[PDB]
Each structure stands twice: as C-alpha cells, then as structure tokens.
C-alpha cells in the first residue's frame, strides 16, 4: 500500500450532466436552453443532443452508489443544481449586503431568511437530494457537496433573450445581483444538507466560465473574475455561519508550459493569470483591482488586500486532464496547437503522445506539476476532484488511470497533501456542448435502456483502492503515457 490509509477513492458527478433521463426533467437551467438553442444547433455550437435523455441518476442513484461500492469507492463529490432548488426567483427575500464601493464585502443571512427561502424553494428537489445524500451516508461515503457547476437558473441567466448580434455567449457569469442570490443559495443549501455532507465546494471550474466571452480583453477577464471571487467568498461566509465544516473550491488546472521549457517567465505570467490570481484572492485576501486598467492594458493593479476575502479557502479541489503550452505574443500569449487540449485533428501530439477522443493529449506529468505548485504556494489540503478520459472502448483508460495515480503517489511523497482521488464520470454522461458521444465513464451507459456496463478500467480501479495504491503488477499499464 503506497497511498496513506484513509486515502479517498471515488467519483465526481455534476447534476446537469447525469440527473435527467427518466423522471425529474429540469428545463429551468440556462445550459438546458443553451443545448436546445436553434442557432447553436444549426451552427454546430452544440451537438444537438439533449440533456433530458441522459443517465437518469435522478432515479438510478441507489444502483450507481452500490456499483461504486463494488468497485472500491468510499467517497464522492456531488453537484446540486441551483435551478432545481430555486426554480423561481429569490430576490424577494431581502437580506443585508455590505458594499465598499464596488466591492461586495459582506452578505448576512438570518434564520428567518432561511425560513422564507424554504417557503419558495422546491421541496421535492431538497427531499430527493437528501435521499441521495442519505443513501451515500448509508454506504459510508465521504461526501463533497459542490454548490455550483456552470449552469444557472433561467431567472439568473436566460440565453433565450440574448441576441447573436453581440456575440454568441452563454453568459453564465456573476454580477452583483447574481452574487447576492448565490449567497442565499449557498446559505440555504448548508441549511438544508449540512447534516448529510462532509465538506463544501462553492463552485466547480469557475475559470472555464470567466475565461470566455471577453473578446480577448484582459480588463473584461479580470473584472468578470472578481465577481466569481466575491461569489466564492460570500458563499463561504454564509455557509460558515451555518456549518463548522470545511469549505473549498474546485478549479480547472490546465498545466501551463512553454515549448521545450524555453520561457520560464512567460509560464509564471500565464500561471498567475489563469490560476493563482484567483486562488490568492480567496486564500490570503491578496487580490487585484480593475479601477485603473485601460481597456488595452494587460495586467491588474496587484497587491490589493481585502480583509473580506482573506482565509476563505479551506481546501483545493484539483481537476486535471492535460497540459497547455503557450508562446509569446505582443498582446501577451497564445496557446500552441498540437499539444495538450488542442489535439483535435491530431493523431499523435507533436510530442508523440496519445490523443484522447476529445482531442486531448495524455500528459500525466502535468498533474504532478500542478499539485506541487499548489502545495508550494498554499500548503492547503488537496483533493484530485476530477481526472478522466473520453474512451468508449476503454483502450487507454486503464493506463490513463495508472499513470495519473503514480503521479499522485510521487506528489504525496514529495510533500503534496493529496487526500483522495475522484475519477471523472462513474458513468458516461452529458458532456456539455459535445453531447453524449464523449464517454468518460468507468461504466458505459446505454441511453435507451439506462443500463450500466462495466469497463475493465472499473476493475483496475477496484484493485488500486483494494491495494491502497498502484500494485507493482499493474504499473506497466501507465508506461505508454509517461
């Protein structure tokens, strides 16, 4: 047993991606409308697949939980859906919002506010989520409750009203109005589920959202990202008022590199822009300011301390899939096709590495490098909350799982405080704009019958969890991908 005893093995799940399929259809999300959009389908922006024809976890969760146990899983991260719990607006519940100029420095939810929020919530969704969380506790599951996962209620963001003349963007980013209602949602979820969860995550991969729709404007990027910082910190405070349990965030960690390691300073710049600028703000309170940016300037006013953002991060959820190689541009930087996530039309990467069915280069070395950078900068408890591959025939996933687990074992031995591993997709599910054709699951799903089928990777997973690490007789599987 290489990994420490108690190391968590499990799976991550997004509500929107896995819930619908049989009962409990939710048409009240902006992502649901994004997938049913006429322009988006005709112009190839989305696949035309529909989320309501999905894995039906809303009804089959007991079956999936037992299967998770049977393959050696003892933990999970489940994402609840804001659009399910509050189908209608919560703006009518007036709470206290403190502001220092444009800084949202505080939101306070009282017990009577929680009762008023319960009156307008969807009690059917709360009860079902409690049923899901109670079944997980019945099977001794360490439970990570993730509040937000990209999709928003239509009364928060409605893409149907948008006009394509001003850019075809989903628009699921935070404003001051959104932050206030998000704090009420965070408080209510802790008020509703705290006795059934272990830790909290305020949001999943917020950088995927605030990195888009900026028209290459760095000012719009840092300005939009500030609201996500405040969405996280205010969610943290409102949960902490109710719960004594730990609250963190789940981040998307593309491993930023330069070509043949020839530009260490550029990597430091982009790694700060894409990652540390956000985590620094909610961990130590050292954020930035957009007040003095001209529209064409690249960098923010740094060292802007905020006492209301300080110490609002208890743990870091590390999502990793591939790397991200960049070069210098007069504007700043650009990514290089043929490496990392930009391998769609590629057979092998420009480095000669295997490319997934999403067009993603397999690069387990980035996971170790991402974990070490997080450890060196923050020394916070960490959890690999997502890691997987689109692999219908399970050709690479066995070796993909082994090589990335070896990188976690090395990171731990090198000082990284990694407490568990959550593989992405226990079952195949709805992969956003790509639809159902991208199979990330350890279990394959027949979307007509909803039956789940074992891929051999699920059995390799059970062996890794049984042995508390990669046994020597399974190490050969990862050698192709180093």
Does the annotation count 257 as an active-site position? no
By what technique were these coordinates determined? X-ray
The token pair that represents 459 in the structure block: 């059995």
Give the DSSP per-residue string, 253-291. --EEEEGGG--HHHHHHHHIIIIIHHHHHHHEEEEEE-T
Token duo for residue 427: 């079952």
What is the chain's length?
482
Task: Provide CB contacts within 8 A for 26, sequence distance 6+.
Answer: 16, 19, 20, 32, 81, 83, 84
* Nearest one of 233, 198, 213 to 167, comparing CA atoms: 213
What b/e sequence results for 408-441 when a residue is b if at least 16 CB atoms lie within 10 Å of its CB, and e otherwise?
Answer: bbbbbeeebbbbbbbbbbbbbbbbbbebbebbbb
Contacts 24+ apart (CB under 8 A), 451-460: 452/63, 452/64, 452/67, 452/427, 455/394, 455/397, 456/394, 456/398, 457/391, 457/394, 457/397, 457/398, 457/400, 457/401, 458/71, 459/71, 460/398, 460/401, 460/402
Name residue, tokens 């079902």: 128
Tell me 379's DSSP state.
-
Catalytic residue among 19, 257, 269, 386: 386
| Local structure of 400: helix, strand or coil | helix
Q: Which residues contact 327 (CB under 8 A, 6 or more apart)?
A: 258, 259, 263, 266, 333, 334, 336
Integer Cα distance of 250 and 230 in angstroms? 15
Cβ count within 10 A of residue 171: 17
Q: What is the C-alpha separation between 77 and 145, in angstroms, rounded?
A: 6
CA 128 to chain centre: 22
Tell me the C-alpha distance between 315 and 347, whole Å. 37
Separation CA 373–CA 343 (nearest Å): 25
3-class DSSP state of 304: strand
How far apart are alpha carbons 315 and 477 in whole angstroms?
31
Question: 321: which 2 tokens?
Answer: 């899939």
DSSP 378: H
Which residues does 189 contact at the CB level (< 8 Å), separation at least 6? 80, 85, 145, 147, 239
Q: Give dist(CA 369, CA 288) in Å, integer.
A: 25
CB burial of residue 473 (10 Å; 0-12, 13-18, 19+): exposed
Catalytic (active site) residue 386 = yes
Per DSSP, the residues of 443-464 read EEE-TTT--EEE-HHHHHHHHH
Adjacent-strand bridge partners of 11: 76, 423
| Calpha distance 332→340 (Å, rounded) | 19
Q: Rounded to whole angstroms, how far apart are CA atoms 167 and 384? A: 35
In whole angstroms, give the CA distance from residue 413 to residue 399: 21
Coil, helix or strand for 177? helix
Tell me if 329 sits within 8 A of 342, measured CB to CB.
Answer: no
Strands across the sheet containing 323-329: 255-258, 323-329, 332-335
CA 323 – CA 254 distance, rounded (Å): 5
Task: Using alpha carbons, select from 201, 191, 199, 202 the residue that is nearest to residue 143.
Answer: 199
| Residues near 231 by beta carbon (within 8 Å), at least 6 away in sequence | 148, 174, 178, 179, 182, 202, 203, 206
Q: What are phi and psi of 305, to 5 degrees?
A: -75, 145
List the beta strands (DSSP E) in 52-180. 75-79, 96-100, 103-108, 142-148
Q: Which of 451, 455, 465 is nearest to 63 (CA)?
A: 451
Spatial distance between the Cα atoms of 87 and 120, rounded to a whole number of angstroms: 9
Element (H, E) at 324: strand 323-329
CA distance 482 to 478: 7
Do 129 and 193 meet the contact criterion of CB atoms below 8 Å apart? yes
Q: 60: burial class by Cβ within 10 Å (0-12, 13-18, 19+)?
A: buried
Stated in angstroms to one decimal place, the resolution of this structure is: 2.2
Could you say which DSSP state residue 237 is in?
Answer: H
Angle of the 218-242 helix axis to the 176-193 helix axis, nearest 10: 30
* 8 Å CB contact between 309 and 320: no
Report CA torsion sign: 289, 293, 295, 300: negative
The closest alpha carbon to 65, from 75, 52, 56, belongs to 75
Alpha helices in 343-426 (DSSP H): 365-378, 397-413
Residues 6+ apart with CB under 8 A from 195: none
Q: Which of 81, 181, 205, 218 is catalytic?
A: 205
- What's CA 133's distance to the chain center, in Å? 19
Residue 423 pairs in a beta bridge with: 11
Kindly state the tokens that stand for 458. Answer: 């699920």
Q: Phi and psi dihedrals of 438, rounded to 5?
A: -100, 110
Burial of 237: CB neighbours in 10 Å, binned 0-12, 13-18, 19+: buried
Helices 176-193, 111-120: inter-axial angle, 10-degree rounding: 90
Distance of CA 479 to the CA centre of its chain: 28
* Nearest alpha-carbon partner for 225 in 181, 300, 173: 173
Report phi then psi at 329, rounded to 5. -140, 150
Q: Which residues contact 316 (CB under 8 A, 6 or more apart)?
A: 248, 249, 251, 279, 374, 378, 380, 381, 382, 383
**Backbone breaks in the chain after residues (C–N over 2.5 Å):** none
Torsion angles phi and psi, residue 115, rounded to 5:
-70, -40
CATH architecture, domain 8-481: Alpha-Beta Barrel (3.20)
DSSP letter assigned to residue 4: P
Q: Which residue has the tokens 């226990």?
A: 426
């Amino acid at each position: 047993g290489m990994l420490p005893k108690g190391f968590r093995f499990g799976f991550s799940l997004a509500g929107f991606q896995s819930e619908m399929g049989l009962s409990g259809k939710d048409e009240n999300s902006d992502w649901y409308q994004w997938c049913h959009d006429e322009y988006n389908i005709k112009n190839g922006v989305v696949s035309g697949d529909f989320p309501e024809n999905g894995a039906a976890y809303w009804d089959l969760f007991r079956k999936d939980h037992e299967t998770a146990v049977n393959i050696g899983m003892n933990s999970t991260r489940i994402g609840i859906e804001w659009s399910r719990i509050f189908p209608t607006s919560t703006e009518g519940v007036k709470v206290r919002i403190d502001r220092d100029g444009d800084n949202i420095t505080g939101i306070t939810i009282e017990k009577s506010d929680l009762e008023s929020l319960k009156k307008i919530c969807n009690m059917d969704a709360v009860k079902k989520y409690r049923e899901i969380f109670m079944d997980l506790k019945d099977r001794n599951f360490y439970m990570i409750l993730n509040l937000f996962h990209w999709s928003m209620p239509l009364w928060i963001n409605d893409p149907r009203k948008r006009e394509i003349s001003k850019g075809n963007n989903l628009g699921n980013f935070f404003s001051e109005k959104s932050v206030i209602e998000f704090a009420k949602f965070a408080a209510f979820a802790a008020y509703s589920f705290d006795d059934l969860v272990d830790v909290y995550s305020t949001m999943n991969e917020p950088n995927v959202v605030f990195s888009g729709g900026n028209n290459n404007s760095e000012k719009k990027y840092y300005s939009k990202m500030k609201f996500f910082i405040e969405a996280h910190a205010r969610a943290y405070d409102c949960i902490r008022t109710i719960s004594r349990k730990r609250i963190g965030v789940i981040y998307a960690n593309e491993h930023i590199e330069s070509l043949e390691n020839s530009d260490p300073e550029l990597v430091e710049e982009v790694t700060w822009r894409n990652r540390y600028s956000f985590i620094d703000s909610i961990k130590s309170g050292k954020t930035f300011s957009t007040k003095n940016m001209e529209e064409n300037s690249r960098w923010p006013e740094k060292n802007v301390f905020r006492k209301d953002l300080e110490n609002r991060l208890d743990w870091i959820g590390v999502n990793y899939y591939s790397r991200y190689v960049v070069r210098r541009i007069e504007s700043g930087f650009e990514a290089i096709d043929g490496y990392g996530f930009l391998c769609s039309g590629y057979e092998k990467s420009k480095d000669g590495r295997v490319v997934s069915e999403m067009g993603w280069e397999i690069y387990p070395q980035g996971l170790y490098d991402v974990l070490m950078g997080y450890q060196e900068r923050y020394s916070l408890p960490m959890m690999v909350t997502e890691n997987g591959i689109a692999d219908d025939m399970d050709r690479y996933r066995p070796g993909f799982l082994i090589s990335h687990m070896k990188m976690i074992e090395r990171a731990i031995k090198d000082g990284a405080g990694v407490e568990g591993y959550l593989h992405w997709s226990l079952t195949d599910n709805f992969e956003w704009s790509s639809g159902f054709s991208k199979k990330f699951g350890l279990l394959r799903v027949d979307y007509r019958t909803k039956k789940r089928s074992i891929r051999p990777s699920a059995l390799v997973f059970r062996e890794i969890s049984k042995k508390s690490g990669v046994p020597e007789e399974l190490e050969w599987l990862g050698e192709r991908f180093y």
